[PDB]
Ligand SMILES: [Zn+2]
């Protein structure tokens with residue numbers, strides 16, 4: 644009943660209509676969804692994820 648980012652390290656604003664689905668989980672952006680492949684940051688407020 645709550646739509647949040649899949650990244651367990653980052654609390655990002657997820658768009659209910661533009662949500663990136665991955666592994667059955669919801670993501671704010673492709674960045675967190677793809678586990679950040681080549682250093683792609685997410686549109687998070689202050690952001691946290693810098694790993695992987
Ligand atoms: Zn995110």
Ligand SMILES: [Zn+2]
Pocket residue numbers: 650653674675676679685692
């Ligand atoms: Zn992330």
Ligand SMILES: [Zn+2]
Pocket residue numbers: 650653655684685687690691692
């Ligand atoms: Zn982030």
